[PDB]
Design a binder for this molecule. Structure first.
Ligand SMILES: [Mg+2]
Ligand SMILES: [Mg+2]
Ligand SMILES: [Mg+2]
Ligand SMILES: [Mg+2]
Ligand SMILES: [Mg+2]
Ligand SMILES: [Mg+2]
Ligand SMILES: [Mg+2]
Ligand SMILES: [Mg+2]
Ligand SMILES: [Mg+2]
Ligand SMILES: [Mg+2]
Ligand SMILES: [Mg+2]
Ligand SMILES: [Mg+2]
Ligand SMILES: [Mg+2]
Ligand SMILES: [Mg+2]
Lengths: 394, 176, 239, 344, 124, 46, 101
RNA sequence: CCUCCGCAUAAGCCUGCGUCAGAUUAAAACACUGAACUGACAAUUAACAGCCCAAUAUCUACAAUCAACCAACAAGUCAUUAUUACCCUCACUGUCAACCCAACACAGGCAUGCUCAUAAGGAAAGGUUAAAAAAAGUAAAAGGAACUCGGCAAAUCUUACCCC
RNA sequence: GCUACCUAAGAACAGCUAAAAGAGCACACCCGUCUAUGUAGCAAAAUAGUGGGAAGAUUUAUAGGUAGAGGCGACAAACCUA
RNA sequence: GCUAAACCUAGCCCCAAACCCACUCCACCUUACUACCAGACAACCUUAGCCAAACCAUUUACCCAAAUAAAGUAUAGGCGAUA
């Protein structure tokens, strides 16, 4: 085996001691009294030294073989960086959920009504996009990190401004900086999800059940694919020190316990730092699954059985040009076997809001070709976003 | 307040100020401890006022009315400092029994000069420090020639001084 | 001369580590190898040359899966990250290796030969006579060192009882122990000798200074040497 | 060479210095409501402002960021005004502009930004360079305000004014007889910016009410320990004056108004500056703009900046609830966000 | 060439030298990871100023004060003035013990009390 | 061309090439300082 | 105090207290224009801001608001008779301000 | 009238055209009094850049070029996790200038931003006459390289052939 | 610290034709083929254009290393503080 | 007669005798003239060369033990200038 350790880069061994310590019954005459390092044969052996008073700036942590939270088995914690390879495959294998291409008919029946629209939705969203893309800062070409959350909150405010039409939107709040935690088993493999996204929307009333019992019972006959050359524990933080818990981001007494729609952000000014679309889909699937599992553990206790009242925890992940909608629904908690009842989720892939934006007018031979403005626009993405936002409040 | 930095308003420009006879060592040794501390504070305030007056006189391009008061306060505070240092040394000899509260030892540097190294008081010990170990303390056989040359130079200096003294004595005996 | 090597990483990882150029400077600072200096910045990839290696709590054979084939500027051939199990390690790519391929890293030597493909690896004791192999080792559990460039490959000659003579690309024979793991097939990035340079800008980008301008008179070593084939060097230790 | 007028300064009597540098006056108390238009149609729908729900949502948003929150360390005393009060402020302004949408239709199309800088550049006063190779020559005194509030509400139209343009006040502007370099004020040289929160191509050139927040350096206990009891309201007043002046300048220099060209209509501006518990209220109405010595020779117009004292909203949050909750502060907050533009 | 006879102050080095030199000021804290200073209230010299209300002593002495001989205050005089009377009193009765001497002010070590003399824990 | 500005004012290079630490980190500079002190140099190094 | 070795403070040690200080401040009249609240002093080279605040609030008991100090470098160009530069002693001026207005 | 300049940052001794008295003598290539001076008076106050990061193990292959079509090669300038301990807080270095390196107050040289000519900044001329000679600028009856070894300053704007 | 080479992090290049280019003219910039002025001059190597390059084998701010029985060298016995 | 000519003392060299010294407080090994933090590696080595022998390759007092005569004697030395 070719070792990766260079002798010139590692710490060199200390020189051997002199020929005075190998004499049984003879004490050496070193320089331990003059308190300075000498040229004259002087190099003894100093005993270890420790500090009697602990200092936060000079505190050493003990090794991992005696921590109070150390266990024999290693867990797998997923957060907001674990770039999974086979995103959808690992997501469906760890969450036990059937993949559905199209979206449910409820959001379509709620969004196709011409009355539930803005007085001038197209011009409003165009002005919002133009502002967030160019009129946000003093620079000419803003970075993705400085306009992604800006346009996110702009769209959130635009969707919230329709409270005067539907007297039910006042029961929402955009919670910032939240942490999730949910532990479960997956074929003798202890798993745990712990992430902190951008923002989340929490309501006081839970979302209604989407999938009825018919499709729930029919999904039992659906089997899940499993890759063989790759292990499902790939691209996961394998650690031995952890702590099992089923507590969500809010305890008892909080006015907004039930979530609604999770908002994940990929703020990165570089392509290598941005996540793949399949990776973002897997991340939002895992986040929705963790939220639903935490809600099930908090409401129906810590039991592994089938839930008679399913919960709906939606999610959506953007990046500054494309959108990825998600409608997740948990139906059971026992995930030890792969022959039981599966879950249902509606994933809408490939949803572009606009083709390209030109912050500066291109001039080819003293004449312009494309003026300043979002060239190419698809209102279907904004319609689906408004539908997912208004699905909570009828 | 801020009016203590000046003298009496009636003495604002009275040519000569009558103030003399500073403190002595015996009068300072006769006092206790709190009295000496309060007297030191009063002398410090007086020296600050005199410094302000001297600065104002130097800015106004006029001579100082009484410059001897500053020297008097200075020597009084120096005598008080000497008294308190002697008291501290006596107490240290009665308790610990070692002179000079600054510890150290006679160590030879690289230049071969027998100097008195003063301890810097660190946190970590010396057998693992990074900066203290880089401070060498050995002559190494190459400075003996320089030490011999310095000794010869000092011997020449002393011999020339003795020759000058002898020439002066001869001139004194010849003229007188 | 505070010359410290950039090879300060005793753990295998996947992130490309930044490397520092040398230009012919050792620990003293004098130029000892002429023709190196001034080139485009490159990043080093930790390439795992050892083919067969068991994972944690593993021992038997394991499957792999080729993901994506990239390019390595530190060599002529291209590399390809192949995932498998719960880890990902960089290995040398072979000819006709694309995305979605499946390779095997076995070690159990069978009674007869194994008609393996040009992607999987098997010990020399289970390969038929006359098979284009590459990345051959010298000692059991040491690592592949010979035949690792672009397109280079070797062909098995014969077998005796516990050795395996491998024909090297230099037309020279060389034997090795039977329990040595070697890949099967040819390395990718073929037709490398047909790469036309075009201008000195490419050589300056690669990091190669022009040769010396001094006119050196050719001595007696500039003539053609028609020499026979050197004898086969043996690596098998015999008591 | 231009100065750097920092709104969140730590100087002593910087309020009078800023009033002299901006030609503004201060009036203790809120401005009187415009009683010019007599509304005869006072008997119709009139949606009643349910203060109970507003107080409930306010206390909920306060306890969300102050009481219970899944944090990942302890609660460091430092940076506590950036992870507790800073998110609470934007949550409160968001829920306010969300609940006040049916009552005020102007907030439906308003652009609610989050932490956007506002810059403004002008010339005020002159002096004589003592040293350098340009001695004995006249030069201008340039200033620059680099303020970055937390939340801004920009609308399309302009709000209704309070006092007329030709309003006269017997209270003169404060003056100083010293060099402007005495307080912690310095001169640099960089790119001049006149920014309001968006570019000129945005149709939302005007605004409504801004919100600020003092950092951890300008706390109350830190000033009380440094023997500065009367240095609590002056910093708030100076910050409010600087922010409102920069906002009015950025709004006026986007329609074609500057030093020479004056204004044709006053620019009313509002701002709500608060800290971690105490809330302050200030007002402003841009009257004049020519501040150069060449144009400010016969300019009787003076700027007016209203304001009040700092009143706390809560008092000791403990026992999983609130102990004290003043209602007049919330009433003034919900009233300052319902100012509708004058539409005939 | 540059100057050599002048000392090295804090106005000679570039941007990387202004800071670590200083003018010999005593540090009262340290730095952190956010370019901040952590000042410790236990490191700043606290000036203890006593009350000067009922203090009848002027900084200048009158010329009517008689002079006296000057002599240093050695440790032997202080010893014979402080500890000698107590020792003579306890020995004249019959209770002196040369085993324990901690009741006269003598301390075998300096690590017990706060204000140590040989290491000098107090400033000035 | 105008070959006369053979000096570039810089304190970092001066301290790193002719500093007291560099002089005493090698017996050569120590002997140089000894000869300077023997001759009568008021200033030893930069 | 100046020219005195300060004791090394350990994490959790007693309060560093000085009795007989060795500082000499000088009240110098401002040369340029200054407001009515800013007072200019002259502290030695071994004195900071909090030390000056404590010195002014302990002895003179003057309410100090803010302290802004800087180093003044004396002139060094005057030549003697044997062609040698004359170094002037440097000092550190202060700019304290009152608290109660 | 010029602006092929100036203002800041970077490097650099640090007090080097502010006041007062001397201005009899002393340095202005001569004078007033002052960029080649003697002594006294005090400038510059940070928010500007630094002064930096408690450990044990682990994680980081899909560039930039409006990055959204396409297209590559020189294969590339930026990111975290689990655990332990830590709720004392705003101290320090400079903020002047007409300035640096070349023995100089030298037609030499110096990195980036700002309007590429403006709101920065300066005076080719001490006076008298129009000697010869020399240098820098406009053109000339006829020839346009016929003078010079050679199209050697110069303006028109210029094609083909040979060697390397 | 000027100059030969190397190393790590940065900056510079208007406009037109842009044939895809170690493309062309041309600002700032890198070097200096010729004329004229002086050789105790502005200068122990200067002044304007006629000049070549100016999207790359280009230039440059910072820091470090290679020194004489040698360093370096796209080889001039060229450079290593006039 | 203007320019400008002289006015003795800091002392300087070697003898005899004698052996000569090194913190008032702070700072001095990193960017000495810097109060405060985690790899401890750093000496132990024929000196050479010029000149002379008309060049020069062997060789050429210099080596640190008190005078002198022996004695420049035996000796070494391209058996020669020399030691
Ligand atoms: Mg070749
Ligand atoms: Mg050749
Ligand atoms: Mg300045
Ligand atoms: Mg010169
Ligand atoms: Mg001008
Ligand atoms: Mg003339
Ligand atoms: Mg003619
Ligand atoms: Mg001819
Ligand atoms: Mg020509
Ligand atoms: Mg070259
Ligand atoms: Mg080109
Ligand atoms: Mg070109
Ligand atoms: Mg040649
Ligand atoms: Mg000879």
């Amino acid at each position: 085996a070719y070792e990766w350790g260079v002798r010139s880069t590692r710490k060199s061994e200390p020189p051997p001691l002199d020929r005075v310590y190998e004499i049984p019954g003879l004490e050496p005459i070193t320089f331990a009294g003059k308190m300075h390092f000498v040229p004259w044969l002087a190099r003894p052996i100093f005993p270890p030294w420790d500090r009697g008073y602990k200092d936060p700036r000079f505190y050493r942590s003990p090794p991992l073989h005696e921590h109070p939270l150390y266990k024999d088995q290693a867990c797998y914690i997923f957060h907001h960086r674990c770039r999974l390879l086979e995103g959808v495959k690992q997501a469906l294998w760890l969450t036990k959920t059937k993949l559905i291409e199209g979206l449910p008919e409820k959001v379509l029946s709620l969004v196709d009504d011409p009355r539930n629209h803005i007085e001038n939705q197209d011009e409003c969203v165009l002005n919002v996009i133009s502002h967030a893309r160019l009129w946000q800062t003093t620079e000419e070409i803003p970075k993705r990190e400085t306009y992604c959350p800006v346009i996110v909150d702009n769209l959130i405010q635009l969707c919230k401004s329709q409270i005067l039409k539907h007297p039910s939107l006042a029961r929402r709040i955009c919670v910032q900086n939240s942490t999730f935690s949910a532990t479960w088993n997956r074929e003798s493999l202890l798993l745990q999800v712990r992430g902190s996204g951008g923002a989340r929307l929490s309501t006081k009333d839970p979302l209604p059940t989407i999938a009825s019992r018919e499709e729930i019972e029919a999904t039992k006959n659906h089997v899940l694919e499993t890759f063989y050359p790759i292990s499902p524990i790939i691209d996961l933080h394998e650690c031995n020190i952890y702590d099992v818990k089923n507590d969500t981001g809010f305890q008892e007494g909080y006015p907004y316990p039930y979530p609604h729609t999770l908002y994940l952000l990929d703020k990165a000014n570089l392509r290598p730092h941005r996540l793949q679309p399949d990776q973002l889909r897997a991340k939002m699937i895992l986040f929705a699954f963790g939220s639903a599992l935490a809600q099930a553990r908090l409401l129906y206790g810590n039991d592994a059985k089938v839930l008679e009242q399913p919960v709906v925890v939606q999610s959506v992940g953007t990046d500054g040009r494309v959108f990825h909608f998600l409608v997740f629904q948990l139906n059971t908690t026992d995930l030890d076997c792969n022959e039981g009842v599966k879950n249902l989720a509606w994933v809408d892939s490939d949803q572009l809001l606009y083709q390209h934006f030109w912050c500066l007018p291109v001039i080819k031979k003293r004449v312009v070709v494309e003026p300043v403005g979002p060239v190419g626009f698809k209102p279907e993405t904004f319609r689906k976003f408004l539908a997912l936002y208004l699905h909570g409040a009828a | 307040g801020l009016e203590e930095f000046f003298d009496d308003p009636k003495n604002w420009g009275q040519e000569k100020v009558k103030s003399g006879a500073a403190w002595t060592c015996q009068q300072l040794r006769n006092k206790s401890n709190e009295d000496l501390h309060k007297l030191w504070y009063v002398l410090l305030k007086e020296r600050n006022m005199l410094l302000t007056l001297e600065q104002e006189a130097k800015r106004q391009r006029l001579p100082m009315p009484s410059p001897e008061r500053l020297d008097k306060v200075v020597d009084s505070m120096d005598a008080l400092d000497k008294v308190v240092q002697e008291r501290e040394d006596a107490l240290r000899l009665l308790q610990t029994g070692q002179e000079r509260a600054r510890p150290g030892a006679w160590r030879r540097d690289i230049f071969g000069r027998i100097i008195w190294h003063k301890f810097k008081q660190w946190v970590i010990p010396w057998h693992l420090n990074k900066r203290y170990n880089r401070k060498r303390f050995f002559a190494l056989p190459y400075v003996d020639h320089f030490l011999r040359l310095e000794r010869e130079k000092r011997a020449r200096i002393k011999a020339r001084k003795e020759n000058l003294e002898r020439k002066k004595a001869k001139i004194l005996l010849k003229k007188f | 001369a505070n010359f410290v090597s950039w090879k300060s990483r005793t753990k295998y990882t996947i992130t490309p580590v930044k490397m520092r150029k040398s230009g012919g400077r050792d620990h003293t600072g004098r130029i000892r190898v002429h023709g190196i200096g001034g080139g485009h910045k490159q990043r080093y990839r930790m390439i795992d040359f050892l083919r067969f290696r068991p994972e944690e709590t593993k021992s038997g054979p394991f499957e792999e899966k080729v993901i994506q084939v990239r390019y390595d500027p530190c060599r002529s051939a291209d590399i390809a990250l192949v995932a498998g199990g719960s880890r990902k390690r960089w290995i040398i790519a072979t000819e006709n290796m694309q995305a979605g391929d499946t390779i095997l890293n076995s070690n159990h030597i069978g009674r007869m030969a194994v008609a393996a493909r040009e992607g999987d690896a098997h010990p020399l004791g289970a390969l038929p006579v006359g098979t284009l192999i590459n990345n051959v080792e010298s000692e059991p559990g040491r690592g592949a060192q010979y035949i690792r460039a672009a397109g280079t490959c070797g062909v098995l000659l014969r077998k005796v009882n516990g050795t395996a003579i491998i024909q090297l690309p230099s037309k020279r024979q060389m034997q090795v122990l039977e329990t040595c793991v070697a890949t099967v097939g040819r390395v990718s990035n073929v037709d490398h000798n047909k790469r036309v340079i075009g201008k000195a800008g490419r050589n300056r980008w690669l990091g190669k200074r022009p040769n010396s301008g001094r006119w050196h008179r050719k001595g007696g070593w500039a003539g053609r040497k028609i020499r026979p084939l050197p004898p086969m060097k043996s690596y098998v230790k015999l008591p | 060479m231009k100065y750097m007028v920092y709104p969140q300064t730590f100087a002593l009597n910087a309020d009078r210095w800023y009033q002299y540098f901006t030609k503004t006056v201060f009036l203790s108390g809120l401005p009187p409501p415009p009683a010019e238009p007599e509304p005869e149609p006072e008997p119709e729908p009139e949606p009643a402002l349910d203060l109970a729900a507003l107080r409930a949502v306010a206390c909920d948003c306060l306890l969300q960021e102050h009481f219970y929150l899944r944090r990942r360390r302890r609660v460091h005393r430092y940076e506590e005004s950036e992870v507790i009060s800073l998110p609470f402020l934007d949550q409160l302004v968001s829920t306010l502009v969300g609940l006040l949408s049916p009552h005020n239709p102007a907030l439906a199309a308003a652009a609610l930004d989050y932490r956007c800088p506002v810059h403004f550049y002008w010339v005020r006063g002159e002096e004589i360079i003592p040293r350098g190779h340009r001695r004995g020559r006249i030069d201008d005194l340039r200033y620059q305000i680099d303020d970055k509030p937390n939340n801004q509400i920009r609308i399309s139209k302009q709000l209704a004014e309070f006092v007329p343009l030709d309003y006269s006040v017997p209270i003169e502007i404060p003056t100083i007889k010293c060099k402007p370099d005495k307080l912690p004020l310095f001169k640099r040289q960089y790119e001049n910016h006149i920014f309001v929160g968006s570019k000129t191509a945005d149709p939302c050139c005007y605004g409504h009410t801004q919100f600020h927040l003092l950092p951890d350096k300008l706390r109350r206990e830190r000033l009380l320990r440094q023997n500065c009891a009367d240095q609590i309201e002056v910093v708030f007043r100076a910050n409010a004056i600087a922010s409102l002046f920069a906002w009015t300048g950025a709004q006026a220099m986007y329609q074609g108004f500057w030093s020479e060209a004056d204004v044709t209509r006053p620019f009313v501006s509002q701002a709500v500056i608060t800290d971690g518990k105490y809330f302050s209220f200030f007002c402003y109405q841009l009257n004049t703009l020519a501040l150069t010595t060449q144009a400010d020779q016969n300019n009787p117009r003076k700027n007016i900046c209203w304001g009040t004292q700092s009143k706390p909203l809560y008092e000791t949050i403990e026992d999983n609830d609130v102990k004290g909750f003043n209602d007049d502060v919330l009433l003034q907050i919900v009233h300052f966000l319902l100012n509708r533009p004058k539409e005939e | 060439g540059a100057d050599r006879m002048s000392k090295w102050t804090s106005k000679r080095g570039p941007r990387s030298f202004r800071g670590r030199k200083g003018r010999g000021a005593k540090g009262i804290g340290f730095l952190t990871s956010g370019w901040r200073f952590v000042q410790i209230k236990e490191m700043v010299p606290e000036f203890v100023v006593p009350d000067l209300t009922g203090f009848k002593l002027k900084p200048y002495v009158s010329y009517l004060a008689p002079e006296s001989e000057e002599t240093p205050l050695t440790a032997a005089q202080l010893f014979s003035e402080a500890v000698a009377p107590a020792i003579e009193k306890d020995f004249k009765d019959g209770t002196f013990d040369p085993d324990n001497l901690e009741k006269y002010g003598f301390e075998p070590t300096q690590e017990g009390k706060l204000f140590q003399l040989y290491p000098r824990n107090f400033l000035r | 061309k105008a070959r006369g500005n053979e000096y570039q004012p810089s304190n970092i290079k001066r301290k790193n090439k002719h500093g007291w630490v560099r002089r005493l980190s090698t017996p050569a500079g120590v002997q140089v300082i000894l000869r300077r002190m023997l001759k009568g140099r008021k200033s030893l190094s930069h | 105090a100046r020219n005195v070795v300060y004791p090394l403070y350990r994490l959790g040690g007693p309060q560093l207290r000085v009795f007989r200080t060795n500082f000499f401040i000088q009240l110098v009249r401002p040369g340029v224009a200054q407001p009515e609240d800013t007072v200019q002093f002259r502290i030695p080279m071994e004195m900071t801001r909090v030390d000056l605040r404590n010195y002014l609030e302990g002895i003179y008991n003057v309410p100090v608001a803010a302290v802004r100090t800087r180093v003044q470098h004396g002139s060094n160009k005057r030549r003697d008779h044997r062609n040698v530069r004359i170094k002037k002693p440097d000092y550190k001026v202060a700019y304290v301000q009152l608290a109660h207005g």
